[PDB]
Each structure stands twice: as C-alpha cells, then as structure tokens.
Amino acid sequence: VRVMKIAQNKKIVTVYPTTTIRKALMTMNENKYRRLPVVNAGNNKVVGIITSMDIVDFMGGGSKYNLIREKHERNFLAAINEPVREIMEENVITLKENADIDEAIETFLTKNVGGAPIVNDENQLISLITERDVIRALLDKIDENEVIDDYITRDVIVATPGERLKDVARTMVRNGFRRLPVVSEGRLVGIITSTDFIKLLGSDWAFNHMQTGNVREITNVRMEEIMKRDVITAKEGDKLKKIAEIMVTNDIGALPVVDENLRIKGIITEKDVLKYFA
Ligand SMILES: Nc1ncnc2c1ncn2[C@@H]1O[C@H](COP(=O)(O)OP(=O)(O)O)[C@@H](O)[C@H]1O
Ligand SMILES: Nc1ncnc2c1ncn2[C@@H]1O[C@H](COP(=O)(O)OP(=O)(O)O)[C@@H](O)[C@H]1O
Ligand SMILES: Nc1ncnc2c1ncn2[C@@H]1O[C@H](COP(=O)(O)OP(=O)(O)O)[C@@H](O)[C@H]1O
Ligand SMILES: Nc1ncnc2c1ncn2[C@@H]1O[C@H](COP(=O)(O)O)[C@@H](O)[C@H]1O
Ligand SMILES: Nc1ncnc2c1ncn2[C@@H]1O[C@H](COP(=O)(O)O)[C@@H](O)[C@H]1O
C-alpha cells in the first residue's frame, strides 16, 4: 500500500537554505503549515526541515537560542535576518517514493517524527506524509469498540498558568513535546502549543515590543496570557475511533485525558492512535 497513494496531492510549501528565519516564519504563519522542508532552489533536493519547534528552540527553548544571545547580542530582529540554514534540522528523516504505509507508520512510531518528506532516488522532493494523513486514510479501519485506555500516555509533562514563556519553551524543546496541558492545583486549566508561540511573534503586541526591543518581554509573558483555556479533552472509556476522528477533522494532534473533575489522567496524541496499527 504505497504512501504516495495517500500523499497529499497538493504542492508542498517549502523554503530555501538562504531564506531568512523571518521569511520562514511568515511562510509558516501564512500557509498555516508548521512543518517546512528546506530544498535547493536549485535541484529541489531536500537539505533540511524547519518546524515551529525549531523556532521555539531559537526563541529560548534550546541551543539554537545562542544565535540571538551571543552572535546578535540579544537582538531578535537582527537574528531573524539569518538564513534558515543556521537553525534548520539537517539529516532529514525521509521516505522513498516507493515506500508503503507500514514503513511510514514504523518511521513515525520509532523515529519520533510526525511528518516526513517523500523523495525520489535523487533526494528530490516529491511529496510529504504526516501522521494525520495516515490516520485519515485508515480511520474507517479502526474497530468501533476499541477503547483509548491502552494508548494513553500516563506520565504527563505539564505547564502552569504562571510559567514564563522562556521556561515553557525549555520544557517543550527538552522533552520534544509540541503540546503541554496547563495544570493548576491538579486541574486542567488550559493548553499551550509551539504554534501559540509563533502566533505571539506575529502579533501587534509583539512587533510593538521588538521595535523598542526589549525583545525580552516576549519571552517573559506568562501562559495565562496566551494559553487556550477551553480544551478539547478525552476521558477513559472513549472510543479510539471517535478520538481519532476528532483529531483528523480538527487538525489537532493531542487531547489531554481528564476526570469529570478535570484532573489529568494522561494525554493521547496522533502517534498514540497509530499504535493501533503497530
Ligand atoms: N509544508 C507543507 N506543505 C503542504 N502541506 C503540508 C505541509 N506540512 C503539512 N502539510 C499538511 O497539512 C496538515 C498539517 O500537518 P500535521 O498538522 O499533519 O503536520 P504539521 O504539524 O508539521 O504541520 C497535514 O494533513 C499535512 O498533510
Ligand atoms: N522528517 C524529519 N526529519 C528530521 N527531523 C525532523 C523531521 N520532522 C521534524 N523534525 C525535527 O524534529 C524536531 C521536533 O519537531 P515537531 O516537534 O515540529 O516534530 P514532529 O511534529 O515530527 O514530532 C524539530 O527540530 C524538527 O526540525
Ligand atoms: N506533554 C506531554 N507529556 C507527556 N507525554 C507526552 C506529552 N505530549 C506527548 N506525549 C507523548 O509522547 C509520545 C509522542 O508524542 P507526540 O505525538 O510527538 O506529541 P506532540 O504532538 O505534543 O509533540 C506520545 O506517546 C505522546 O502521548
Ligand atoms: N546557529 C547558531 N546556533 C546557536 N548558536 C550560535 C549559532 N551561530 C552562532 N552561535 C553562537 O553565537 C556566537 C557567534 O559566534 P560566530 O558566529 O562564530 O561569530 C557564538 O557564541 C556561537 O556559539
Ligand atoms: N486539544 C485541544 N483543545 C483545544 N485547542 C487545542 C487543542 N490542541 C491544540 N489546540 C490549539 O490549536 C492551535 C494549533 O495547535 P497545534 O496542535 O500545535 O497545531 C493552538 O492554538 C493550540 O493551542
């Protein structure tokens, strides 16, 4: 069952190694695509990939932050004029154009990636497949009585309403999690994702600070200011197919699992759903 058969027939939105970080961000925010292959202009060969998590790293979450703090002496606006090649991931995990669905699933499940460029024998970009694409294709094949319980991640990494963005960013990047439930006194009170951090950057409130920057008030912002308070949740006993359908029809990748009292029992994501087909 060739992945190309599911592969989104659209044109893949890409950037080049010399595209600035700023332009890559605009590309992300505009096209709503939070995963961008980096290709030569060129021969269309995949030479890198950049996602919102790399941007969260750059902003403070990880080692890429030292482009701002050291080279550009804390100037975020200057730093974003650097070519995306400075912060992209190289050594991309890709699939061959003759790869089947089984391979894609094993790749997603064992290599901690949610999306992979599909390339030909010259490493030229052909398409791209993500976990959502696969779940969407296989949704009707999930038994309707199957429950979510065995698929839930029980030990949840979490943010709080009072945490500063700079510290939540660390939590996201160190743990490799795009989405953190926000918890206060054991109760779910919101959700925050790497996407929220990009959206903050493209705000009026943000560009205002950057000019007088003082870029620092961006990363000092607390979760309560920017989190989504009303969260789509799952609960023990829910059908896997219902949950999978909610994700795929809403472009959401993660639901916090809660009590009727909103205590957190776990989290379930698209990768977990795909463990049904492992
Ligand atoms: N760069 C891109 N160009 C075109 N389509 C994309 C691109 N990135 C993701 N998609 C598609 O848009 C949807 C969003 O991807 P998921 O949300 O699946 O990946 P991501 O969180 O990295 O953006 C997916 O269904 C995927 O098929
Ligand atoms: N196909 C891939 N090959 C190599 N690295 C990738 C790939 N996809 C994403 N990444 C990297 O994994 C890190 C986490 O990204 P996200 O958190 O955006 O990835 P994912 O949604 O696939 O779990 C980022 O540094 C990103 O560049
Ligand atoms: N915040 C979290 N705390 C603990 N585990 C998580 C968290 N987010 C995701 N996971 C788990 O890690 C594995 C891979 O998660 P993934 O699909 O990359 O999540 P995300 O979309 O947040 O990056 C899954 O088993 C998922 O349940
Ligand atoms: N892409 C990068 N990611 C993280 N840190 C960087 C990056 N580029 C430069 N730096 C750091 O910023 C400073 C600039 O050094 P240099 O670019 O060699 O003049 C050094 O402290 C580097 O460690
Ligand atoms: N389970 C959820 N319930 C409500 N909003 C969510 C949920 N998951 C993600 N979001 C929001 O959806 C938007 C895109 O998130 P993302 O899953 O990172 O692409 C962000 O503003 C998230 O805060």
Side-chain angles (χ1 to χ4, degrees):
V1 190
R2 304 236 125 84
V3 289
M4 277 308 290
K5 270 98 195 199
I6 300 154
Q8 15 154 147
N9 67 260
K10 162 169 183 171
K11 56 274 287 164
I12 303 313
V13 172
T14 61
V15 300
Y16 312 104
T18 50
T19 303
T20 63
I21 292 160
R22 184 185 172 104
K23 184 79 182 177
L25 277 170
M26 290 160 59
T27 308
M28 282 189 92
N29 270 24
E30 277 167 26
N31 297 286
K32 225 210 184 298
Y33 299 128
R34 270 52 200 240
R35 178 191 313 269
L36 305 177
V38 186
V39 298
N40 297 141
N43 41 217
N44 220 36
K45 287 172 188 178
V46 177
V47 299
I49 191 158
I50 187 95
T51 73
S52 55
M53 271 285 124
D54 295 305
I55 300 296
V56 171
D57 187 329
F58 173 68
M59 277 165 25
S63 184
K64 293 161 192 195
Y65 175 68
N66 263 33
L67 190 61
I68 296 164
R69 189 164 261 171
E70 285 294 306
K71 187 164 182 170
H72 297 273
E73 306 180 20
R74 300 233 38 177
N75 198 349
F76 174 78
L77 253 29
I80 57 172
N81 281 351
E82 293 279 352
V84 86
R85 81 193 163 195
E86 288 287 342
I87 65 161
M88 72 183 183
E89 288 292 308
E90 308 186 50
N91 200 7
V92 182
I93 293 169
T94 72
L95 303 161
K96 295 291 160 194
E97 50 178 347
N98 66 294
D100 84 320
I101 212 171
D102 272 27
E103 198 193 354
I105 288 164
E106 192 182 41
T107 295
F108 294 151
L109 267 41
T110 65
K111 309 298 168 182
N112 203 33
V113 280
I118 295 149
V119 303
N120 64 16
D121 275 355
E122 352 292 326
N123 197 53
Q124 290 180 297
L125 185 70
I126 289 315
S127 193
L128 182 109
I129 187 96
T130 69
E131 293 171 315
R132 194 155 315 131
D133 288 336
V134 178
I135 293 172
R136 190 175 283 111
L138 303 176
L139 183 68
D140 71 22
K141 312 291 170 68
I142 306 166
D143 166 358
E144 285 217 278
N145 303 305
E146 234 296 343
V147 90
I148 60 157
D149 302 20
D150 283 356
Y151 305 86
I152 302 164
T153 296
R154 159 278 251 119
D155 282 343
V156 197
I157 302 283
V158 137
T160 66
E163 274 185 276
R164 302 169 174 106
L165 185 156
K166 75 206 209 312
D167 298 315
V168 173
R170 284 260 227 209
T171 305
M172 287 179 177
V173 169
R174 295 292 321 160
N175 287 278
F177 304 142
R178 292 163 53 177
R179 1 256 182 177
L180 303 177
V182 190
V183 172
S184 186
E185 271 243 282
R187 264 71 185 164
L188 185 72
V189 287
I191 195 164
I192 191 79
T193 77
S194 60
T195 286
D196 294 313
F197 295 177
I198 317 296
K199 287 175 163 177
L200 186 59
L201 280 184
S203 69
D204 286 332
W205 183 84
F207 200 58
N208 132 72
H209 271 271
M210 297 176 197
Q211 304 293 28
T212 80
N214 217 41
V215 295
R216 196 180 71 199
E217 221 62 58
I218 299 169
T219 59
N220 282 321
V221 177
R222 302 185 181 259
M223 293 309 87
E224 67 189 357
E225 297 303 325
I226 58 160
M227 75 183 182
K228 176 71 173 152
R229 287 180 199 275
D230 295 282
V231 195
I232 297 160
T233 63
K235 57 166 87 266
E236 282 181 296
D238 291 346
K239 298 313 198 318
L240 178 63
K241 184 164 158 181
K242 160 184 160 71
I243 296 311
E245 183 177 42
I246 284 152
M247 295 170 171
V248 140
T249 61
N250 286 288
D251 287 322
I252 284 160
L255 292 65
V257 189
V258 300
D259 263 13
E260 203 100 321
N261 274 71
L262 300 179
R263 262 140 108 63
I264 318 298
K265 310 304 302 312
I267 187 168
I268 181 157
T269 71
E270 288 175 315
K271 197 184 300 303
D272 295 320
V273 171
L274 284 178
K275 293 166 182 177
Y276 185 81
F277 302 89

mmCIF file of all heavy atoms in Angstrom, residues 252-275:
data_model
loop_
_atom_site.group_PDB
_atom_site.id
_atom_site.type_symbol
_atom_site.label_atom_id
_atom_site.label_comp_id
_atom_site.label_asym_id
_atom_site.label_seq_id
_atom_site.Cartn_x
_atom_site.Cartn_y
_atom_site.Cartn_z
ATOM 1 N N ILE A 252 -6.005 18.737 15.029
ATOM 2 C CA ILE A 252 -5.496 18.810 16.394
ATOM 3 C C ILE A 252 -4.708 17.516 16.567
ATOM 4 O O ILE A 252 -5.098 16.483 16.018
ATOM 5 C CB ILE A 252 -6.668 18.921 17.411
ATOM 6 C CG1 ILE A 252 -7.253 20.339 17.393
ATOM 7 C CG2 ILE A 252 -6.228 18.553 18.839
ATOM 8 C CD1 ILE A 252 -8.666 20.436 17.968
ATOM 9 N N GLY A 253 -3.592 17.564 17.285
ATOM 10 C CA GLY A 253 -2.747 16.380 17.421
ATOM 11 C C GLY A 253 -2.765 15.738 18.791
ATOM 12 O O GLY A 253 -2.278 14.624 18.949
ATOM 13 N N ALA A 254 -3.324 16.436 19.778
ATOM 14 C CA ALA A 254 -3.269 15.985 21.167
ATOM 15 C C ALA A 254 -4.491 16.398 21.986
ATOM 16 O O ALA A 254 -4.907 17.560 21.953
ATOM 17 C CB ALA A 254 -1.993 16.496 21.837
ATOM 18 N N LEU A 255 -5.060 15.439 22.714
ATOM 19 C CA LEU A 255 -6.103 15.723 23.699
ATOM 20 C C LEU A 255 -5.633 15.306 25.098
ATOM 21 O O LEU A 255 -5.206 14.163 25.292
ATOM 22 C CB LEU A 255 -7.419 15.007 23.351
ATOM 23 C CG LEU A 255 -8.259 15.402 22.128
ATOM 24 C CD1 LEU A 255 -7.528 15.141 20.812
ATOM 25 C CD2 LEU A 255 -9.582 14.641 22.135
ATOM 26 N N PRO A 256 -5.681 16.238 26.070
ATOM 27 C CA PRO A 256 -5.486 15.884 27.474
ATOM 28 C C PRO A 256 -6.607 14.940 27.902
ATOM 29 O O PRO A 256 -7.755 15.132 27.498
ATOM 30 C CB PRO A 256 -5.613 17.232 28.198
ATOM 31 C CG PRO A 256 -5.250 18.244 27.163
ATOM 32 C CD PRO A 256 -5.818 17.695 25.890
ATOM 33 N N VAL A 257 -6.269 13.910 28.672
ATOM 34 C CA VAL A 257 -7.265 12.976 29.195
ATOM 35 C C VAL A 257 -7.600 13.407 30.619
ATOM 36 O O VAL A 257 -6.709 13.527 31.469
ATOM 37 C CB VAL A 257 -6.774 11.504 29.149
ATOM 38 C CG1 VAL A 257 -7.903 10.539 29.492
ATOM 39 C CG2 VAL A 257 -6.191 11.176 27.778
ATOM 40 N N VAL A 258 -8.881 13.666 30.863
ATOM 41 C CA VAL A 258 -9.312 14.202 32.150
ATOM 42 C C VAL A 258 -10.431 13.426 32.837
ATOM 43 O O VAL A 258 -11.171 12.649 32.219
ATOM 44 C CB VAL A 258 -9.737 15.706 32.072
ATOM 45 C CG1 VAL A 258 -8.584 16.577 31.583
ATOM 46 C CG2 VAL A 258 -10.979 15.885 31.193
ATOM 47 N N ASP A 259 -10.523 13.693 34.140
ATOM 48 C CA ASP A 259 -11.617 13.311 35.019
ATOM 49 C C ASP A 259 -12.846 14.130 34.696
ATOM 50 O O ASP A 259 -12.773 15.112 33.945
ATOM 51 C CB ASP A 259 -11.239 13.675 36.457
ATOM 52 C CG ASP A 259 -10.671 12.515 37.237
ATOM 53 O OD1 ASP A 259 -10.337 11.474 36.626
ATOM 54 O OD2 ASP A 259 -10.560 12.641 38.476
ATOM 55 N N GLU A 260 -13.973 13.759 35.296
ATOM 56 C CA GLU A 260 -15.131 14.636 35.294
ATOM 57 C C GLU A 260 -14.824 15.860 36.165
ATOM 58 O O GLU A 260 -15.430 16.918 35.985
ATOM 59 C CB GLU A 260 -16.385 13.908 35.790
ATOM 60 C CG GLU A 260 -17.706 14.523 35.311
ATOM 61 C CD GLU A 260 -18.321 13.787 34.120
ATOM 62 O OE1 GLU A 260 -17.577 13.357 33.204
ATOM 63 O OE2 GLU A 260 -19.564 13.648 34.098
ATOM 64 N N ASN A 261 -13.883 15.717 37.099
ATOM 65 C CA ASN A 261 -13.422 16.856 37.897
ATOM 66 C C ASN A 261 -12.227 17.586 37.291
ATOM 67 O O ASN A 261 -11.693 18.530 37.886
ATOM 68 C CB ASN A 261 -13.137 16.450 39.343
ATOM 69 C CG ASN A 261 -14.377 16.502 40.206
ATOM 70 O OD1 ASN A 261 -15.280 15.680 40.063
ATOM 71 N ND2 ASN A 261 -14.427 17.472 41.113
ATOM 72 N N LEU A 262 -11.828 17.138 36.102
ATOM 73 C CA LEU A 262 -10.780 17.779 35.307
ATOM 74 C C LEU A 262 -9.378 17.529 35.829
ATOM 75 O O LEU A 262 -8.445 18.266 35.497
ATOM 76 C CB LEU A 262 -11.038 19.284 35.140
ATOM 77 C CG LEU A 262 -12.355 19.631 34.444
ATOM 78 C CD1 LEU A 262 -12.538 21.141 34.345
ATOM 79 C CD2 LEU A 262 -12.450 18.986 33.057
ATOM 80 N N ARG A 263 -9.229 16.497 36.649
ATOM 81 C CA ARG A 263 -7.905 16.017 36.995
ATOM 82 C C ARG A 263 -7.341 15.285 35.794
ATOM 83 O O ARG A 263 -8.074 14.599 35.080
ATOM 84 C CB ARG A 263 -7.959 15.105 38.217
ATOM 85 C CG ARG A 263 -7.612 15.849 39.491
ATOM 86 C CD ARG A 263 -8.502 15.437 40.656
ATOM 87 N NE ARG A 263 -7.818 14.622 41.661
ATOM 88 C CZ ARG A 263 -6.785 15.024 42.403
ATOM 89 N NH1 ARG A 263 -6.260 16.237 42.253
ATOM 90 N NH2 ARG A 263 -6.257 14.191 43.291
ATOM 91 N N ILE A 264 -6.039 15.433 35.577
ATOM 92 C CA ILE A 264 -5.375 14.868 34.404
ATOM 93 C C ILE A 264 -5.041 13.404 34.621
ATOM 94 O O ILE A 264 -4.344 13.052 35.581
ATOM 95 C CB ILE A 264 -4.051 15.604 34.099
ATOM 96 C CG1 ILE A 264 -4.220 17.116 34.255
ATOM 97 C CG2 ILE A 264 -3.525 15.230 32.698
ATOM 98 C CD1 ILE A 264 -5.237 17.725 33.314
ATOM 99 N N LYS A 265 -5.523 12.557 33.716
ATOM 100 C CA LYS A 265 -5.225 11.127 33.762
ATOM 101 C C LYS A 265 -4.166 10.722 32.744
ATOM 102 O O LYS A 265 -3.651 9.597 32.786
ATOM 103 C CB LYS A 265 -6.496 10.305 33.525
ATOM 104 C CG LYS A 265 -7.708 10.705 34.377
ATOM 105 C CD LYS A 265 -7.425 10.678 35.888
ATOM 106 C CE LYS A 265 -6.970 9.305 36.392
ATOM 107 N NZ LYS A 265 -7.838 8.172 35.911
ATOM 108 N N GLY A 266 -3.848 11.630 31.829
ATOM 109 C CA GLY A 266 -2.937 11.315 30.739
ATOM 110 C C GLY A 266 -3.100 12.265 29.575
ATOM 111 O O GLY A 266 -3.696 13.338 29.708
ATOM 112 N N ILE A 267 -2.546 11.876 28.436
ATOM 113 C CA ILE A 267 -2.656 12.638 27.203
ATOM 114 C C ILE A 267 -2.619 11.588 26.107
ATOM 115 O O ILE A 267 -2.009 10.527 26.277
ATOM 116 C CB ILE A 267 -1.506 13.694 27.074
ATOM 117 C CG1 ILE A 267 -1.719 14.621 25.864
ATOM 118 C CG2 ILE A 267 -0.120 13.021 27.057
ATOM 119 C CD1 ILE A 267 -0.805 15.849 25.841
ATOM 120 N N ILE A 268 -3.307 11.850 25.004
ATOM 121 C CA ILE A 268 -3.268 10.952 23.857
ATOM 122 C C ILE A 268 -3.039 11.779 22.599
ATOM 123 O O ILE A 268 -3.628 12.848 22.434
ATOM 124 C CB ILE A 268 -4.547 10.075 23.770
ATOM 125 C CG1 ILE A 268 -4.485 9.124 22.563
ATOM 126 C CG2 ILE A 268 -5.819 10.946 23.773
ATOM 127 C CD1 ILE A 268 -5.376 7.898 22.687
ATOM 128 N N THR A 269 -2.163 11.296 21.727
ATOM 129 C CA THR A 269 -1.826 12.044 20.534
ATOM 130 C C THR A 269 -1.985 11.167 19.311
ATOM 131 O O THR A 269 -2.226 9.957 19.419
ATOM 132 C CB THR A 269 -0.375 12.588 20.575
ATOM 133 O OG1 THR A 269 0.553 11.505 20.422
ATOM 134 C CG2 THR A 269 -0.088 13.343 21.876
ATOM 135 N N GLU A 270 -1.827 11.781 18.146
ATOM 136 C CA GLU A 270 -1.873 11.072 16.877
ATOM 137 C C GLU A 270 -0.884 9.918 16.800
ATOM 138 O O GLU A 270 -1.194 8.889 16.201
ATOM 139 C CB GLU A 270 -1.630 12.037 15.723
ATOM 140 C CG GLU A 270 -2.791 12.976 15.479
ATOM 141 C CD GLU A 270 -2.503 14.007 14.409
ATOM 142 O OE1 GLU A 270 -1.404 14.604 14.417
ATOM 143 O OE2 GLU A 270 -3.391 14.234 13.566
ATOM 144 N N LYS A 271 0.303 10.079 17.393
ATOM 145 C CA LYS A 271 1.278 8.987 17.400
ATOM 146 C C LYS A 271 0.740 7.794 18.183
ATOM 147 O O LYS A 271 0.919 6.647 17.768
ATOM 148 C CB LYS A 271 2.640 9.418 17.956
ATOM 149 C CG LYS A 271 3.772 8.439 17.597
ATOM 150 C CD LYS A 271 5.111 8.811 18.231
ATOM 151 C CE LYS A 271 5.592 10.197 17.805
ATOM 152 N NZ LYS A 271 5.727 10.337 16.329
ATOM 153 N N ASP A 272 0.075 8.072 19.304
ATOM 154 C CA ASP A 272 -0.556 7.034 20.122
ATOM 155 C C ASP A 272 -1.665 6.300 19.388
ATOM 156 O O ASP A 272 -1.802 5.083 19.526
ATOM 157 C CB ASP A 272 -1.159 7.635 21.386
ATOM 158 C CG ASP A 272 -0.121 8.216 22.306
ATOM 159 O OD1 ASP A 272 0.957 7.601 22.456
ATOM 160 O OD2 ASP A 272 -0.393 9.284 22.889
ATOM 161 N N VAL A 273 -2.480 7.052 18.647
ATOM 162 C CA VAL A 273 -3.538 6.475 17.817
ATOM 163 C C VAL A 273 -2.937 5.474 16.841
ATOM 164 O O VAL A 273 -3.467 4.376 16.668
ATOM 165 C CB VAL A 273 -4.342 7.563 17.045
ATOM 166 C CG1 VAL A 273 -5.285 6.934 16.019
ATOM 167 C CG2 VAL A 273 -5.128 8.430 18.012
ATOM 168 N N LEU A 274 -1.818 5.847 16.224
ATOM 169 C CA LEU A 274 -1.170 4.980 15.252
ATOM 170 C C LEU A 274 -0.612 3.684 15.847
ATOM 171 O O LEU A 274 -0.293 2.755 15.103
ATOM 172 C CB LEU A 274 -0.092 5.735 14.463
ATOM 173 C CG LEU A 274 -0.514 6.715 13.358
ATOM 174 C CD1 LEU A 274 0.727 7.370 12.772
ATOM 175 C CD2 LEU A 274 -1.315 6.024 12.260
ATOM 176 N N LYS A 275 -0.509 3.604 17.175
ATOM 177 C CA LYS A 275 -0.075 2.360 17.822
ATOM 178 C C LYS A 275 -1.109 1.238 17.674
ATOM 179 O O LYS A 275 -0.784 0.064 17.876
ATOM 180 C CB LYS A 275 0.270 2.585 19.293
ATOM 181 C CG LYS A 275 1.496 3.449 19.527
ATOM 182 C CD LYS A 275 1.537 3.896 20.979
ATOM 183 C CE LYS A 275 2.724 4.800 21.263
ATOM 184 N NZ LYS A 275 2.709 5.296 22.673
#
